[PDB]
PDB file of C-alpha atoms in Angstrom:
ATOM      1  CA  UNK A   1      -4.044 196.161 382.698  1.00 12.16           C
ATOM      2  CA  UNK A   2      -4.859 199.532 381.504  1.00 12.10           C
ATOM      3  CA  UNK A   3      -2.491 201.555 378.836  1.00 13.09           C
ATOM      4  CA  UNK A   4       1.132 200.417 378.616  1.00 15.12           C
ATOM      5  CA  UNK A   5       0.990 198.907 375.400  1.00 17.47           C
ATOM      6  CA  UNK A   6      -2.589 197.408 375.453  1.00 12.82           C
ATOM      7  CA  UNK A   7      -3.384 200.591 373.642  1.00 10.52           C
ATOM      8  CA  UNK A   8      -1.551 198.941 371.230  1.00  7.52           C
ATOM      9  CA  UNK A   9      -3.389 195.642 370.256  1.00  3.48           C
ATOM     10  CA  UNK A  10      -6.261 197.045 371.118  1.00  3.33           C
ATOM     11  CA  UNK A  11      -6.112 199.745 368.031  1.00  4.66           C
ATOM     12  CA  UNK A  12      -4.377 196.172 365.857  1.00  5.36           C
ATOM     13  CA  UNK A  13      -8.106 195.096 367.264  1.00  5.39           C
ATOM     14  CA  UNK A  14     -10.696 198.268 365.834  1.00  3.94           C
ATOM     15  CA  UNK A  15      -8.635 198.034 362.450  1.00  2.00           C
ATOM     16  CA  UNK A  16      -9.509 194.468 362.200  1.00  3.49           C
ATOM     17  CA  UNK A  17     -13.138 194.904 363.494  1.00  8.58           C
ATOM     18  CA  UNK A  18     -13.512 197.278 360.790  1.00 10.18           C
ATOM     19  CA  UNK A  19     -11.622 194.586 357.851  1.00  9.70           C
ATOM     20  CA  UNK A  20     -14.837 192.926 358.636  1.00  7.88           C
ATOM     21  CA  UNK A  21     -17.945 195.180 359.110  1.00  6.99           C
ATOM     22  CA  UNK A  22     -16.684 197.636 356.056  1.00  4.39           C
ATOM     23  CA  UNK A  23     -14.702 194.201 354.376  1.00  3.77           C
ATOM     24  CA  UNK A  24     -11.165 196.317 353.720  1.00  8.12           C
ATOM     25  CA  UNK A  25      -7.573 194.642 354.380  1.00  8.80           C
ATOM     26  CA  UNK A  26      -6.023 198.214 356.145  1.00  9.21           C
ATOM     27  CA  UNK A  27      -2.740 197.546 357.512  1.00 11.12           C
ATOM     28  CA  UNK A  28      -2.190 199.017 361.054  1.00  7.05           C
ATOM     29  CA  UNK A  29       1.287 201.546 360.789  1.00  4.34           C
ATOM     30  CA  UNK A  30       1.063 202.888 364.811  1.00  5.56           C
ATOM     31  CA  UNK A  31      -1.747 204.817 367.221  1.00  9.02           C
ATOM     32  CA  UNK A  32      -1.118 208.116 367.288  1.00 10.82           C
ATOM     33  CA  UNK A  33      -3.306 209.983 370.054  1.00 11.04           C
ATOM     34  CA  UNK A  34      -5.254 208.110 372.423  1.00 12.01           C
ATOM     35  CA  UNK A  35      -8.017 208.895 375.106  1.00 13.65           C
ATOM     36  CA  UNK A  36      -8.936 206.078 377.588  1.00 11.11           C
ATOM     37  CA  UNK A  37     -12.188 206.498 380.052  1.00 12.49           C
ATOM     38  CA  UNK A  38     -12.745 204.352 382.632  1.00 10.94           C
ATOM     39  CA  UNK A  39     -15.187 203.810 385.339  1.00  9.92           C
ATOM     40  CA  UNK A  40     -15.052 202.020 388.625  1.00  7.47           C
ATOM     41  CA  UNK A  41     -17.472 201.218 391.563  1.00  7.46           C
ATOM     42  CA  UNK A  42     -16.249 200.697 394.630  1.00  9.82           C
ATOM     43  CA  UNK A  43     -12.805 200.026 393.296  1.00 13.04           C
ATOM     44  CA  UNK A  44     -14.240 197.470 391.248  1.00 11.49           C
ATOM     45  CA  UNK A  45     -13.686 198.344 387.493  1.00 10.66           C
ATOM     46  CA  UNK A  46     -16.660 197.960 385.264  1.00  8.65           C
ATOM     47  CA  UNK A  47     -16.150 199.718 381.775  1.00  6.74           C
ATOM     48  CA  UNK A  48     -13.798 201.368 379.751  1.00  6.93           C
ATOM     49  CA  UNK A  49     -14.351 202.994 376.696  1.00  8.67           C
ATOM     50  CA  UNK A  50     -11.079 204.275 373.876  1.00  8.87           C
ATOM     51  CA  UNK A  51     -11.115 207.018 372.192  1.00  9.49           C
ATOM     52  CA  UNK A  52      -8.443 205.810 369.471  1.00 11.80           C
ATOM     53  CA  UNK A  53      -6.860 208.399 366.726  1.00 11.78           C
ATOM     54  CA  UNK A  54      -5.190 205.706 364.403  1.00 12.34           C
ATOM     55  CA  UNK A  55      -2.796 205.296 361.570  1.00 13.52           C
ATOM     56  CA  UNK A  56      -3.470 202.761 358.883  1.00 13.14           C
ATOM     57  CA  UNK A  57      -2.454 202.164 355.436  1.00  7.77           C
ATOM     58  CA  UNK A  58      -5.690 202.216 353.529  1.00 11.90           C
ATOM     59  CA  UNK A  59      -4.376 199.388 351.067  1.00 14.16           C
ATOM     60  CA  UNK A  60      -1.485 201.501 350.422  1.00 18.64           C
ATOM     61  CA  UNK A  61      -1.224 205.162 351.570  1.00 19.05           C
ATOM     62  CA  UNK A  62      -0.457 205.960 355.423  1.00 21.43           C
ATOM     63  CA  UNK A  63      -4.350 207.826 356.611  1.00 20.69           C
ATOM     64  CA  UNK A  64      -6.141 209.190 359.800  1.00 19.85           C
ATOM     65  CA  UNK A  65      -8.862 207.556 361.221  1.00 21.67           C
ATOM     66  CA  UNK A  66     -10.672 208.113 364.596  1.00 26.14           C
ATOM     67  CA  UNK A  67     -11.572 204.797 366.210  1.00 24.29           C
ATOM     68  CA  UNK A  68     -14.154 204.366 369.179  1.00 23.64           C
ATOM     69  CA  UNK A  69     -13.452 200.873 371.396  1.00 22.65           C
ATOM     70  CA  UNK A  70     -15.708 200.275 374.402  1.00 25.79           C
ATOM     71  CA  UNK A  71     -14.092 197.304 377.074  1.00 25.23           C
ATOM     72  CA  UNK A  72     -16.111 195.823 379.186  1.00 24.94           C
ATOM     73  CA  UNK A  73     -14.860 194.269 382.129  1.00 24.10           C
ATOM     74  CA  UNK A  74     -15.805 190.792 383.652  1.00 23.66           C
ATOM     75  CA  UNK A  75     -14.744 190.609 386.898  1.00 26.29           C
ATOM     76  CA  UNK A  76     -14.852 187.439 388.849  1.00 25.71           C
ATOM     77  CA  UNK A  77     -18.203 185.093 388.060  1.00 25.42           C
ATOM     78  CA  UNK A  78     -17.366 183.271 385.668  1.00 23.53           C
ATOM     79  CA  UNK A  79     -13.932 184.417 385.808  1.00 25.03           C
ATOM     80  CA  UNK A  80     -12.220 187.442 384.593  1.00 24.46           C
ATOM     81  CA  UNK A  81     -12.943 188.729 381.324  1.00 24.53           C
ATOM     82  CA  UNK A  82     -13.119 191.435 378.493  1.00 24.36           C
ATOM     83  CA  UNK A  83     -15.489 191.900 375.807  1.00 24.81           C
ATOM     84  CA  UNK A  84     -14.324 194.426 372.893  1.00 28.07           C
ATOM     85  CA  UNK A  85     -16.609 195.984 370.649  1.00 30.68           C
ATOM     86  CA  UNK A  86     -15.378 198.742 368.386  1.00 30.02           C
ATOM     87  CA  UNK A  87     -17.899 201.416 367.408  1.00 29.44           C
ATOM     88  CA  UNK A  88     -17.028 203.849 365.166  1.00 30.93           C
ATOM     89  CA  UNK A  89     -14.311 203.819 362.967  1.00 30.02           C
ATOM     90  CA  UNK A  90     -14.288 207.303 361.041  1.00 26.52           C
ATOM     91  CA  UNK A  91     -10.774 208.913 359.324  1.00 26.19           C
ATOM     92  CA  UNK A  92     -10.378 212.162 360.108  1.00 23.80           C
ATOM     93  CA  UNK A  93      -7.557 214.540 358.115  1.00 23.13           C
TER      94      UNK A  93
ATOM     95  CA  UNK B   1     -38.478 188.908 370.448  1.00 22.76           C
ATOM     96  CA  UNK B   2     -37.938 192.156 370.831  1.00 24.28           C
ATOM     97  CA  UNK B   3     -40.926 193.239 372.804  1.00 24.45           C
ATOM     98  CA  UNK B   4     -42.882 195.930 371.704  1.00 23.73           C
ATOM     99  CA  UNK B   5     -43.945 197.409 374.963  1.00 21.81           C
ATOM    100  CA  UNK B   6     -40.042 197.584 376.134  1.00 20.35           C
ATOM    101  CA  UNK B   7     -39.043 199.406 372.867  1.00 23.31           C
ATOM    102  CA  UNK B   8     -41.522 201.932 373.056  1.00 26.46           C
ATOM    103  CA  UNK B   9     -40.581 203.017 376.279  1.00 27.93           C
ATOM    104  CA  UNK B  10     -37.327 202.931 375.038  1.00 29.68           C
ATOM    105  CA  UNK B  11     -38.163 205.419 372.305  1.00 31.13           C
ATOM    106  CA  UNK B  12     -40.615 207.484 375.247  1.00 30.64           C
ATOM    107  CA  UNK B  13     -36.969 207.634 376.819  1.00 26.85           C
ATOM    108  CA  UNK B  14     -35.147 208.730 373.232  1.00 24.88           C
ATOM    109  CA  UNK B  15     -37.841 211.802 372.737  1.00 22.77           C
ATOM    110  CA  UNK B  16     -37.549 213.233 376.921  1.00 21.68           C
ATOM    111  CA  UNK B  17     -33.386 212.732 376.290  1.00 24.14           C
ATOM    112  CA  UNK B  18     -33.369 215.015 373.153  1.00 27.81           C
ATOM    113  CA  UNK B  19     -35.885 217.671 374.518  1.00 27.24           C
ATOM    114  CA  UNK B  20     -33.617 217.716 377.695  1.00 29.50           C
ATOM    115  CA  UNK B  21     -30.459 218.095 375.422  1.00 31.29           C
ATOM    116  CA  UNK B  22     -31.984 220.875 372.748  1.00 34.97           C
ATOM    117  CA  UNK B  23     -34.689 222.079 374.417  1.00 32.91           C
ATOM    118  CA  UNK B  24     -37.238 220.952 372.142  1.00 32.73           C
ATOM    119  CA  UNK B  25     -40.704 219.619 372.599  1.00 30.34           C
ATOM    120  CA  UNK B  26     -41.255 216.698 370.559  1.00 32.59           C
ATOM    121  CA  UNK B  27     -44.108 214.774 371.331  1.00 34.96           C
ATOM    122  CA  UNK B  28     -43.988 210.908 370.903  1.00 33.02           C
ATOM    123  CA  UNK B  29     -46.572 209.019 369.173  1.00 35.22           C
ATOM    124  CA  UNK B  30     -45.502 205.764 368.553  1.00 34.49           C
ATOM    125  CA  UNK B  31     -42.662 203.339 367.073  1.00 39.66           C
ATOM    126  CA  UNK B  32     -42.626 202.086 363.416  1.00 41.13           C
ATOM    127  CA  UNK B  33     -39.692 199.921 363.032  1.00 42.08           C
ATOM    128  CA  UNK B  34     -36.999 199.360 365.585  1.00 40.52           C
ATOM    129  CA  UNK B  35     -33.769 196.962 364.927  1.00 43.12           C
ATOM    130  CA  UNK B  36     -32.063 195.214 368.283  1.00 43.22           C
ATOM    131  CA  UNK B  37     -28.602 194.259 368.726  1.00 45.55           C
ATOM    132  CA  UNK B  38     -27.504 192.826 371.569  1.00 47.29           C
ATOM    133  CA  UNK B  39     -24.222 191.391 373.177  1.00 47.29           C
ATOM    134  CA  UNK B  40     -24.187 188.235 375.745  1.00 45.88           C
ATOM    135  CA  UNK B  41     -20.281 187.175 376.735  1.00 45.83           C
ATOM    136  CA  UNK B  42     -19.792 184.381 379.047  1.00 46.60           C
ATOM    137  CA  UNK B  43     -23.065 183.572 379.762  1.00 47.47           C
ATOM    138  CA  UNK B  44     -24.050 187.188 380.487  1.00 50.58           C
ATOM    139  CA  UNK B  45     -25.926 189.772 378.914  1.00 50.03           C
ATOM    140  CA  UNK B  46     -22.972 192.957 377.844  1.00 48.17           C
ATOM    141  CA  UNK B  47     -25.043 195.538 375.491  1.00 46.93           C
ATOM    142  CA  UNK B  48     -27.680 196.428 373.678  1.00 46.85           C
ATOM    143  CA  UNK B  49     -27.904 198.512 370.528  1.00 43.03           C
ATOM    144  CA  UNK B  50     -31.295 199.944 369.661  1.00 44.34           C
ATOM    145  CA  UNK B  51     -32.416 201.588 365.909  1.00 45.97           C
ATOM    146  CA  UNK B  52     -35.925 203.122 366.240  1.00 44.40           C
ATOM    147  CA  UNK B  53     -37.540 204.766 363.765  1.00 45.53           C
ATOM    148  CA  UNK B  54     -40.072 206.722 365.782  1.00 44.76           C
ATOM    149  CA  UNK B  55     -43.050 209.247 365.065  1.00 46.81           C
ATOM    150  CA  UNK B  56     -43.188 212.535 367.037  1.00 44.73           C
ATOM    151  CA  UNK B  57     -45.104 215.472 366.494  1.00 41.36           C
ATOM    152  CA  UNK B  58     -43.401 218.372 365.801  1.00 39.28           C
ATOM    153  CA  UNK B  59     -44.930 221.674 366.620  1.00 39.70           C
ATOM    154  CA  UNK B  60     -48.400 219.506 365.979  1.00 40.30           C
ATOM    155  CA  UNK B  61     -46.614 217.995 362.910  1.00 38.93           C
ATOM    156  CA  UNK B  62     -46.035 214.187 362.865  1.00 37.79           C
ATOM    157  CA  UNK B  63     -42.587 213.733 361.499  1.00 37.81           C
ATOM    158  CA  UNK B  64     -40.547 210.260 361.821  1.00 36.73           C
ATOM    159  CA  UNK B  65     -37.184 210.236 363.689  1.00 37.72           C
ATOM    160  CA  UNK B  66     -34.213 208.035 364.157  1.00 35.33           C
ATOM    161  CA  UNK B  67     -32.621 207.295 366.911  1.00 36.91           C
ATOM    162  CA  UNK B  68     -29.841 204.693 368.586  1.00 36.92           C
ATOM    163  CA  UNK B  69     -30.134 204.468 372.263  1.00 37.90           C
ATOM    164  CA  UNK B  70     -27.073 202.385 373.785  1.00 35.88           C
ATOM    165  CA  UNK B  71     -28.604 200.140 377.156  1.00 34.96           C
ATOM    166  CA  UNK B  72     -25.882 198.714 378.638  1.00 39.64           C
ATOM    167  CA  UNK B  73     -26.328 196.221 381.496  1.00 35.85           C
ATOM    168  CA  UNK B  74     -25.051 195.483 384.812  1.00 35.21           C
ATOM    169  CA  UNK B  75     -25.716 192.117 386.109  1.00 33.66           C
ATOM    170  CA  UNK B  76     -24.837 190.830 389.322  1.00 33.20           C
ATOM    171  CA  UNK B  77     -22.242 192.508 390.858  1.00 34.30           C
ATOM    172  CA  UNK B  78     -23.650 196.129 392.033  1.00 37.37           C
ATOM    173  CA  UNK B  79     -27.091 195.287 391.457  1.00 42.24           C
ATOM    174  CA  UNK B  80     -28.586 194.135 388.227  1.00 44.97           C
ATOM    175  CA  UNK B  81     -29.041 197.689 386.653  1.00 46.30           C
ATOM    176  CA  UNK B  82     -29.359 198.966 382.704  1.00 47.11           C
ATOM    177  CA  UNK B  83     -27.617 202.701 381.978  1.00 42.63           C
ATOM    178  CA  UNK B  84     -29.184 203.506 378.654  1.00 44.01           C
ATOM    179  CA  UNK B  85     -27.840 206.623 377.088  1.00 44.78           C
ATOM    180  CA  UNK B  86     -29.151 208.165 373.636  1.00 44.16           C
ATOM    181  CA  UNK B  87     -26.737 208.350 370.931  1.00 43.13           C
ATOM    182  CA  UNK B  88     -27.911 210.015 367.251  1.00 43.40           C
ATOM    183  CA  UNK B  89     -31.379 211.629 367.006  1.00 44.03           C
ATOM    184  CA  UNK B  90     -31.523 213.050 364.023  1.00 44.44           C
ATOM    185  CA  UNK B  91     -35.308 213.169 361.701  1.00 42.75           C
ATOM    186  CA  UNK B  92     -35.227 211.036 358.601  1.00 41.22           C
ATOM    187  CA  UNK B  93     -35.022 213.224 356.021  1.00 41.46           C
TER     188      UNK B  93
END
């Protein structure tokens, strides 16, 4: 589904993403601030993209970072999916 | 293989979005190098990143650009369609 908590795992997910492109080990505290955007065409979804504002522990200090996770959504062939990329992983204040 | 003709429409595309956005009048040239990153999930094609490194002439001036145009493709359900949008066009100074 969309929200609940999902905007959850899905911010454990960018820090992660960026443990590996950028080789840290951040430890995810909480999200702060979230923004989601989705689209839909004729009621089926297609695409979602997250505007995450984060809180991670940069080795050791709680900091601010502004994440950017697109979704995209697999609908039925061949079966129901999601594909996560993060793009843009920027602290902030 | 990236194919040259397809990237250099790509970039033909990169130039018209930024003189749409800032009302400038670049003129394209050609493309010098261009990087291509793309996604396929479950048997189907997801994204595309694309890094060009582009020549323009600038009030008669060539100059080289960068940009990272974003193609991301719909497959079977509403038609098979590509949305590119431009993201980052900055010179290469």
């Amino acid at each position: 589904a969309s929200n609940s908590l999902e905007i959850e795992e899905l911010a454990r997910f960018a820090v992660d993403e960026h443990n590996k492109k950028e080789n840290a080990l951040l430890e995810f505290v909480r999200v702060v601030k979230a923004k989601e955007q989705a689209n839909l065409y004729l009621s089926t979804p297609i695409d979602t993209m997250y505007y995450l504002t984060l809180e991670a522990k940069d080795g050791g200090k709680k900091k601010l970072y502004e994440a950017k996770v697109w979704v995209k959504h697999i609908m039925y062939y061949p079966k129901t999916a999601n594909f996560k990329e993060l793009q843009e992983f920027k602290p902030v204040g």
